[PDB]
A = this chain, B = another copy of it.
Amino acid sequence: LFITNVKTILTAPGGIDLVVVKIETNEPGLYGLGCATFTQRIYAVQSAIDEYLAPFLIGKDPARIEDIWQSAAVSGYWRNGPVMNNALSGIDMALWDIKGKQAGLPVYELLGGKCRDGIALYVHTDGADEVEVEDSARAKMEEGYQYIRCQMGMYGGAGTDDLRLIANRMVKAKNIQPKRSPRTKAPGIYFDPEAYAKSIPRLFDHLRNKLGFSVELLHDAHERITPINAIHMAKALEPYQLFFLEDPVAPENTEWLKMLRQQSSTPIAMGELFVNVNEWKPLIDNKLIDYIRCHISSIGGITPAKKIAIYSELNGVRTAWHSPGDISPIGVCANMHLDLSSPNFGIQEYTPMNDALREVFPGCPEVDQGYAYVNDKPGLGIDINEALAAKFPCEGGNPTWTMARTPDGTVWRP
């Protein structure tokens, strides 16, 4: 048994660009699928696969998943980055898919078997003020979601190039207002870290008053404030007992978590942005987070994700893999096979899928009253209809939201 062909498929059935890898073998009908999706970079990841990892694999036995991972990881010398890791993930997940197909077992059966019979999900809710958020959250709870991420506005702004309209809305509502900008300013999506941070604890006081303490509430700070203001936020949110506060610092600010954890008892999630062991390992070792957030394709696939899950397990840290819309259904299944086999599973973020995703990727997990139920089919239990995928070509482009500027025009980590 050996690898005959490796290709990349770029498709966007859910309206978000995805990168999928298919590895073909010399056994008729036996192939594996993997997720490479770094949505902002699809063409650079495609090159990293098609021009490099693809020819590197031809003629090799797919059974040596670890040897392939280790040798591919260093094949370009330099390594540990989101383009390199996503390319590696596409390969690695496809090789696990093939191993499970060869075994006649789902990948979760190879990784230790089921530790639970359903995967608990959390979903996003939002709104422009605390009543809109309350109503959005209540509607998700009525659908059976028991864990809800609640966001309000866009980090103190409106998601536009100007703060004046939202500031006037805040004046009228008697709420905290964002700052006035200089008389001319650079293009970007303007926000206000100070108005945002000062507003957050009142939002959660309101949600607890209205929704109660049974439901689990989550909040994502998304690296939007200074570290000391995040420490203060984490402390201010303690009375509301959030399931977690996510990304209070940028990866480049991870040293500030030592101070945060000497002060706050709010649980902390970090790491959708992580690409490098020197980011995640010291946080797990030192108990500086309670949930590891990696986007598994950005750390290189199932092989490294299982290692990070175990490293976390032995430190008492749980998993919450990143899984919003920019992940393919193959990556959603990979997250959930790890989730099922991990003693330390924390929670699974979920973005509801449309009909097109379900038809382009047969095998998507079933969602019923806030839990996901993955199928029992071998490998990752997921397929791709290549002809129907080709009917959803990718948009490409440079996203606008990643130019995020504070009121004075300063570029911030978005």
Interface residues of A (CB under 8 A from B): 38, 40-41, 43-48, 51-52, 55-56, 63-67, 70-71, 74-85, 87, 99, 102-105, 109-110, 112-120, 144, 146, 176-177, 179-186, 194-195, 198, 212-214, 216, 226-229, 231-232, 235, 238, 241, 243, 249, 251-256, 258-259, 261-263, 265-268, 273, 275-279, 281-282, 285, 287, 290, 295, 298, 303, 306-307, 310-311, 313-316, 318, 341, 343, 345, 368-371, 373, 396-399, 402-403, 408-411, 413-414
For A55, the chain B residues whose CB sits under 8 A away are 397-398
Let me know if A82 and B82 touch, CB within 8 A.
Answer: no
Other-chain contact of A51, B43, B56, B371 (Cβ < 8 Å): B43
For A295, the chain B residues whose CB sits under 8 A away are 78
- Given A40-B52, A40-B75, 17 more A-B residue pairs with CB atoms under 8 Å apart are A41-B48, A43-B47, A44-B52, A70-B115, A78-B82, A103-B110, A112-B303, A115-B410, A116-B186, A183-B369, A194-B243, A235-B265, A252-B316, A276-B279, A343-B410, A345-B410, A371-B408
**CA A22 – CA B116 in complex, angstroms?**
26
**CA A411 – CA B313 in complex, angstroms?**
13
Other-chain contact of A41, B52, B118, B267, B403 (Cβ < 8 Å): B52
6 closest A-B pairs by CB: A81-B81, A118-B182, A66-B112, A78-B82, A103-B103, A83-B83
Let me know if A182 and B116 touch, CB within 8 A.
Answer: yes
| Number of copies of this chain that the complex holds | 4
Closest-CB distance, A229 to chain B (whole angstroms)? 7
Let me know if B316 and A64 touch, CB within 8 A.
Answer: no
15 A-B residue pairings within 8 Å (CB atoms)? A41-B52, A44-B48, A64-B113, A74-B411, A74-B414, A76-B399, A83-B83, A102-B105, A116-B185, A117-B186, A117-B408, A179-B214, A254-B278, A261-B262, A281-B314
Other-chain contact of A40, B77, B114, B180 (Cβ < 8 Å): B77
Closest-CB distance, A81 to chain B (whole angstroms)? 1
Q: Taking A254-B278, A277-B252, A341-B66 as contacts, is the C-beta distance between A82 and B76 under 8 angstroms?
A: yes
**CA A51 – CA B48 in complex, angstroms?**
14
Other-chain contact of A213, B65, B198, B266, B268 (Cβ < 8 Å): B198
Closest-CB distance, A315 to chain B (whole angstroms)? 7
Closest-CB distance, A38 to chain B (whole angstroms)? 6
For A265, the chain B residues whose CB sits under 8 A away are 228, 231-232, 235, 263
For A74, the chain B residues whose CB sits under 8 A away are 402, 411, 413-414
Closest-CB distance, A60 to chain B (whole angstroms)? 9
For A235, the chain B residues whose CB sits under 8 A away are 238, 265
Other-chain contact of A180, B116, B177, B370 (Cβ < 8 Å): B370
Let me know if B82 and A398 touch, CB within 8 A.
Answer: no
**CA A318 – CA B279 in complex, angstroms?**
22
**CA A343 – CA B73 in complex, angstroms?**
13
For A179, the chain B residues whose CB sits under 8 A away are 146, 214
**CA A236 – CA B228 in complex, angstroms?**
16
Q: Taking A40-B77, A52-B398, A316-B226 as contacts, is the C-beta distance between A195 and B176 under 8 angstroms?
A: no
Closest-CB distance, A20 to chain B (whole angstroms)? 18
Let me know if B403 and A71 touch, CB within 8 A.
Answer: yes
Other-chain contact of A290, B41, B76, B226, B313 (Cβ < 8 Å): B226
Closest-CB distance, A293 to chain B (whole angstroms)? 13
**CA A171 – CA B104 in complex, angstroms?**
45
**CA A172 – CA B307 in complex, angstroms?**
36
Let me know if A409 and B229 touch, CB within 8 A.
Answer: no
Let me know if A38 and B183 touch, CB within 8 A.
Answer: no
Residue ID in chain B nearest A238 by CB atoms: B232
**CA A402 – CA B52 in complex, angstroms?**
13
Q: Taking A40-B78, A117-B186 as contacts, is the C-beta distance between A180 and B278 under 8 angstroms?
A: no
In this complex, the member of A44, A70, A232, A313 whose beta carbon has the largest number of chain B beta carbons within 10 angstroms is A44
Let me know if A76 and B307 touch, CB within 8 A.
Answer: no
Let me know if B227 and A287 touch, CB within 8 A.
Answer: yes
